[PDB]
Amino acid sequence: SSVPTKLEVVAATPTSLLISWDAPAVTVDYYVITYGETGGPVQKFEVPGSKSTATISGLKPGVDYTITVYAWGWHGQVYYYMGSPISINYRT
């Protein structure tokens, strides 16, 4: 199952995006967000696990981007991203 779920662009401008996702039941330490032109390096940043939204700025207008969210947290003795990271494609 995807972790997190229901990644979506909820608002946009020609050069920016506001993305939102649904947190899992488990404790997330950080979400790592990556983004790059779908026509392929990827840019990356993170937000604390208490947050489930982010903004992405400085994009090229009219270009397809692949956006992926990774939920990093503990699963027993293993700290890594959990489940399957979720991805969307979006063009402004």
Binding site: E46, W72, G76, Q77, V78
Partner: protein, 168 residues
């Protein structure tokens, strides 16, 4: 041979528990001796996510850091456990140079690798989980806390590395 086999190389500063982790994984007991015999490789058949396979654990304990033998272990290895002890700050500071060495030997920025904070049975740690978590997240690799003494996390560490090799 024909049976699926994974070559897992254990690296890290002297004394962090590379050999103890290996012997616990393969032989199910904890070694704390003054002068033990360490094999160049330990093999065992296991099942990981339903897959029967051979693990070949290549312990680099006893090798000089820049020796040809150490290079040979890195070249033959498919994935790496980069081990520090949670009660030894220097061993954690050493991790960076091991990761960079492996990257250069493989001539790749993406080598299957896990970070292992060993001796997690111990009371008074000097490297907090937070520090290792942030490091692993920056590397984009899993972090596992282990005890070769109690076996806590030991299968997790090696099996997580197998999963990283699979998805490479």
């Amino acid at each position: 041979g024909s049976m699926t086999e994974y070559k897992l190389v254990v690296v890290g500063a002297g004394g962090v528990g590379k050999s103890a982790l290996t012997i616990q994984l393969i032989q199910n007991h904890f070694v704390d001796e003054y002068d033990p015999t360490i094999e160049d490789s330990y093999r065992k058949q296991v099942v990981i996510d339903g897959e029967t396979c051979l693990l070949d654990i290549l312990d680099t304990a006893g090798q000089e850091e820049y020796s040809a033998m150490r290079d040979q272990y890195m070249r033959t290895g498919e994935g790496f456990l980069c081990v520090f002890a949670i009660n030894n700050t220097k061993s954690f500071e050493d991790i960076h140079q091991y990761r960079e060495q492996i990257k250069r030997v493989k001539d790749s920025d993406d080598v299957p690798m896990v970070l292992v904070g060993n001796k997690c049975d111990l009371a008074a740690r000097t490297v907090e989980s937070r520090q290792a978590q942030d490091l692993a997240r920056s590397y984009g690799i899993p972090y596992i806390e282990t005890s070769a003494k109690t076996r806590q996390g030991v299968e997790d560490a090696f099996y997580t590395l197998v999963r990283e090799i699979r998805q490479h």
